[PDB]
Design a protein around this ligand. Structure first.
Ligand SMILES: OC[C@H]1O[C@@H]2O[C@H]3[C@H](O)[C@@H](O)[C@@H](O[C@H]4[C@H](O)[C@@H](O)[C@@H](O[C@H]5[C@H](O)[C@@H](O)[C@@H](O[C@H]6[C@H](O)[C@@H](O)[C@@H](O[C@H]7[C@H](O)[C@@H](O)[C@@H](O[C@H]8[C@H](O)[C@@H](O)[C@@H](O[C@H]1[C@H](O)[C@H]2O)O[C@@H]8CO)O[C@@H]7CO)O[C@@H]6CO)O[C@@H]5CO)O[C@@H]4CO)O[C@@H]3CO
Ligand SMILES: [Ca+2]
Ligand SMILES: [Ca+2]
Length: 863
């Protein structure tokens, strides 16, 4: 942990300290104790105070007294020393002055020219920097070359023959955690390729023809069309999960980038089916250089799946076997960033050499070719490691205390998980934007999901947006206008309430065109919340309608809560707009922002449907099938729960805004009720594209994150009636595909603006006498002569969707929709589901009849 540092050096000439004569002490050898200083200077207290530039950047110290540093002081020399200020003694946090004096916008990393190669490293506090060249990926150091410094930037220019060498920086710098000037070996923060485990940086030209698959430069011409961000659907997928169990893929490609180049596999046939039905984007879990998995496959440990398959469904033996090797197996979600700009070595066929670059590109190209754009899960909010030691620490090894956020005592913030980054610092902001550009241009990535976006400054998000949009096919080989951004706008810990500045929270990102996950519709549909009691029911898990026995109040309470969830869901169905007006369950008209969650938050908060990512499931927390298996009454058949799964995914698939699906939603995927399977190996994360199993009942999930819920898991996992058969899995997939086809059969499901939604979208089952467990959504198009709106749909003039979660058939009379030519959607008329085909419309009364646990879409044809 970093020492006590309650003072801030914010500008070349200002130090901030919240004390009630102050002196500055410096030691280039780090030889101070409490003595041992080489230099000292008195700081004259500032009358005016801290400049606006400082307080805007570091709001949390706006009350700190200001102390002026004499202009005769050699600040550039001092920031390379061990420093303390005395009143009481404490260290100083330097990011402010480092930015003020050494903000750098020139090239970083390697730059290639015809006859030379240059290296640039930002290390403003270092006393010395050299580059070490190695004999390949595993050989010894062959040569050391000193770099020269200019305003905090170290560089050297060498011959073009430096190309394809391996290197590391040797950085001599004071490390507060060790209270010593240490000589550290570090990779290039601007690395474009690495040896196994990033032990060395590969000095490769990312633009070289030999690193490009055939037709790579023309990929823009092959990319799937995207008319509007409102046409986006997203499928969230882990790279290893995808092919780890796919026997149709060669053993040598399974689990990595190459598996996507196998178009004839069950996995890729699965994705093509979804893609052909309308799915537009595949969101891949972290695929950059992260820690937690050895790049060297021959170091991997595996369990015997044939053996674990013989253990009882609710036994603790499976998780014991996995946990025993989980630190050295091939598996991890990958949320442990080391270097952002390089593909993960473990996902390549060979961690050394060009394969990781070539195969990543082959992956994007393959996905593009089957109609899918690629989204990267980016994790700019924190680092796997900090400190001077370890192969997993890079940034904080080179410029200690700068890239990571720290508290007012100088301790590193860990709220994100560990080693939070400080995007509010100039060079952190730059690195993030440079990285995004790297993936967009060098890998033609189509979009980005931002992990913990609330931990990132909004100005970083907005500049990245403008930088990405500026990319053109003629200048950069990619159309930046089609690149889509979204993230987790969660507001918590040290960044909450704009404490470190305007951050990327849900509320702050309203009106930015950048999406954020809608946790309101998620919890309203499933019930409860990721941290509450697992048995808390929701709109689609039996609240009021089908009590699961867990006491949740009298029926009056549960019915009221159900109606409340219904309101929240409907606001979400209309793009979760802050200004959309809904007739609430009380009969009162309310804007989306005036309808509140149980904890006082505005339900609707966006300025556009494209700012809303509607979801009911994701990689974190329980899968859709598992959450439903836990919250619904145990008496239900798996056949009924299968229909419940489909209702949930259909609520997303037919909502205004951007639907988000967790890989497996469509096939009843289970993790044996694992709520946090980040380290649960292939066993608990199994994706089965033979459709013979869904991975339910493969033992209690790892105790680390699940033990407290084991008692409720065991009875369900052991019950044969909870497990679906192939027939169920295939049925869910067929119905999922049909609902996707319906979304893309009419533009009406995908309105692009708030004005269009306010004008065309109406909910028909509202008020105090609303029918519980039913949502009716109508969407109008231009009809008759002199229409008050444009005509968007050539085939239909009106669409009505009925979500019926009641266990029984319902008849909804909508007089406003009488005397119209509604028919069940042609997709459902020809459905393999015999239930939905019993849906009906009655023109005389405008009565819609919809079977239990069914979503029926009715259309009014134009012809
Ligand atoms: O940062 C990673 C985190 O991101 C997401 O979480 C966000 C979530 O999606 C948002 O919706 C929102 O959460 C708000 C929530 O919906 C509100 O209801 C309320 O929550 C309060 C609870 O209702 C209340 O019960 C109490 O909860 C306590 C629990 O009862 C108690 O069990 C314990 O919880 C522990 C969890 O059981 C355990 O799983 C573990 O949680 C980790 C998760 O496993 C992991 O996935 C990740 O969390 C994600 C989350 O999945 C995303 O959806 O990290 C978690 C780290 O802990 O540990 C828990 C330890 O607490 O404790 C909790 C309370 O401490 O309190 C809460 C808070 O009032 O308000 C929420 C507002 O925060 O935002 C979150 C992120 O803020
Ligand atoms: Ca497609
Ligand atoms: Ca692991």
């Amino acid at each position: 942990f970093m020492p006590d540092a309650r003072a801030y050096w914010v500008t070349s000439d200002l130090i901030a300290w919240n004390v009630g004569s102050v002196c500055l002490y410096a030691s280039r050898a780090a030889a101070m104790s409490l003595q041992g200083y080489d230099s000292k200077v008195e700081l004259q207290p500032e009358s005016a105070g801290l400049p606006e530039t400082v307080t805007q950047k570091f709001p949390f110290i706006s009350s700190y007294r200001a102390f002026r540093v004499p202009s005769s002081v050699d600040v550039a020399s001092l920031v390379k020393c061990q420093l303390v200020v005395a009143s009481d003694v404490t260290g100083l946090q330097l990011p402010g002055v480092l930015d003020d004096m050494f903000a750098y916008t020139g090239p970083l990393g390697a730059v290639f020219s015809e006859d030379s190669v240059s290296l640039h490293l930002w290390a403003p506090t270092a006393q010395g920097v050299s580059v070490c060249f190695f004999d390949g990926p595993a050989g010894p150091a062959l040569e050391t070359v000193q770099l020269k410094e200019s305003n905090g930037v170290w560089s050297v220019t060498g011959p073009r023959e430096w190309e394809n060498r391996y290197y590391l920086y040797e950085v001599d710098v004071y490390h507060p955690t060790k209270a010593q000037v240490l000589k550290c070996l570090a990779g290039d923060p601007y690395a474009r390729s690495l040896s196994a485990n990033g032990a060395r940086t590969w000095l490769v030209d990312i633009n070289n023809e030999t690193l490009k698959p055939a037709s790579w430069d023309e990929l823009a011409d092959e990319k799937p069309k995207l008319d509007s961000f409102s046409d986006i659907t997203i499928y969230e997928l882990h790279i290893r999960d995808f092919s780890a169990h796919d026997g149709t893929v060669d053993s040598d490609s399974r689990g990595g980038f190459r598996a996507f180049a196998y178009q004839a596999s069950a996995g890729m046939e699965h994705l093509r089916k979804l893609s052909d039905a309308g799915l537009t984007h595949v969101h891949l879990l972290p695929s950059f250089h992260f820690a937690g998995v050895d790049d060297i496959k021959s170091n991997w440990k595996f369990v015997d799946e044939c053996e674990l398959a013989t253990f009882p469904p609710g036994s603790d033996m499976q998780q014991a076997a996995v946990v025993a090797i989980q630190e050295e197996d091939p598996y991890n979600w990958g949320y442990n960033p080391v270097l952002w700009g390089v593909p993960k070595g473990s996902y390549a066929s060979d961690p050394d050499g060009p394969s990781r670059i070539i195969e990543y590109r082959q992956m994007v190209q393959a996905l593009n070719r089957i109609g899918l754009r690629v989204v990267m899960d980016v994790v700019y909010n924190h680092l796997d490691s900090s400190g001077p030691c370890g192969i997993s620490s890079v940034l904080d090894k080179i410029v200690p205390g700068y890239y990571v956020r720290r508290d007012t005592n100088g301790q590193i913030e860990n709220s994100a998980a560990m080693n939070n980054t400080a995007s509010e610092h100039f060079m952190v902001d730059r690195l993030i934007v440079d990285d995004l550009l790297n993936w967009a241009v060098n890998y033609k990535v189509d979009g980005f999901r931002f992990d913990l976006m609330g931990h990132i400054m909004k100005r970083t998000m907005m500049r990245a947006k403008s930088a990405l949009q500026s990319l053109t096919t003629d200048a950069h080989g990619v159309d930046g206008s089609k690149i889509y951004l979204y993230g987790e706008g969660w507001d918590f810990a040290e960044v909450a309430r704009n404490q470190r500045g305007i951050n990327g929270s849900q509320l702050n990102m309203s009106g930015t065109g950048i999406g954020s996950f809608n946790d309101r519709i998620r919890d309203a549909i499933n019930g409860g919340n990721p941290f509450g009691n697992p048995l808390q029911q929701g709109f689609n898990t039996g609240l009021f309608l089908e009590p699961n026995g867990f006491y949740q109040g009298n029926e009056a309470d549960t019915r009221r809560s159900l109606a409340t969830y219904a309101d929240q869901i409907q606001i979400g169905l209309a793009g979760n707009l802050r200004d959309y007006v809904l007739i609430s369950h009380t009969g009162e008209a309310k804007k989306g922002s005036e309808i509140h969650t149980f904890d006082g938050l505005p339900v609707g908060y966006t300025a556009s449907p494209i700012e809303t990512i509607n979801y009911v499931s994701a990689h974190d927390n329980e899968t859709l099938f598992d959450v439903i298996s836990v919250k619904t009454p145990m008496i239900l058949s798996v056949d009924e729960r299968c229909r419940i799964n489909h209702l949930a995914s259909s609520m997303m698939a037919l909502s205004q805004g951007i639907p988000f699906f967790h890989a497996g939603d469509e096939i009843l995927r289970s993790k044996s009720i694992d709520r946090d399977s980040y380290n649960s190996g292939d066993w608990f994360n199994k994706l089965d594209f033979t459709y013979e199993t869904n991975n339910w009942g493969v033992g209690l999930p790892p105790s680390e994150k699940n033990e407290d819920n084991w008692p409720l898991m065991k009875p369900r996992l052991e019950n044969p009636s909870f497990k679906p058969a192939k027939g169920h899995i295939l049925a869910a997939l067929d119905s999922f595909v049909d609902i996707l086809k319906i979304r893309y059969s009419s533009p009406l499901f995908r309105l692009s603006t708030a004005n269009d939604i306010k004008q065309r979208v109406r909910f028909h089952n509202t008020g105090p006498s609303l029918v519980p467990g039913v949502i009716v959504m109508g969407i109008e198009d231009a009809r008759g002569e002199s229409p008050e709106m444009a005509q968007l749909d050539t085939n239909f003039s009106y669409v009505v969707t009925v979500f019926n979660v009641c266990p029984h058939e319902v008849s909804m009379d909508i007089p406003a929709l009488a005397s119209m030519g509604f028919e069940l959607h042609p997709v459902q008329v020809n459905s393999s589901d015999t239930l939905v085909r019993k849906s009906a419309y009655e023109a005389a009364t405008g009565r819609f009849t919809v079977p239990g646990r069914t979503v029926s879409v009715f259309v009014e044809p134009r012809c």
